[PDB]
Design a binder for these strands. Structure first.
Length: 60
DNA sequence: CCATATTTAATCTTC
DNA sequence: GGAAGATTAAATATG
């Protein structure tokens, strides 16, 4: 249950795909999980928090 | 239409 | 004290 703290390489992989789509399909999340070595749930949640981060930034 | 999955909005937790 | 990760319940989307 300890919270995830991403390495640089892992965060770089997340931001690069988020640049392609803010909502990766399960297949994309699945191959992200293999690359980063993290669970699919961690992948899904990182994008969710990231999408919520950009929504606030778009509201002045 | 219906069962299941994904996303949203808000919040809680933790470093 | 601030940001990001994790949780929740409700809303929306999907097959």
């Amino acid at each position: 249950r300890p919270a995830t703290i991403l390495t640089t390489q892992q965060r770089r992989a997340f931001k690069a795909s988020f640049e392609v789509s803010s909502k990766p399909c399960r297949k994309v999340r699945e191959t992200l999980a293999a690359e980063t070595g993290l669970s699919v749930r961690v992948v899904q949640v990182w994008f969710q928090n990231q999408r919520a981060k950009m929504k606030k930034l778009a509201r002045r």
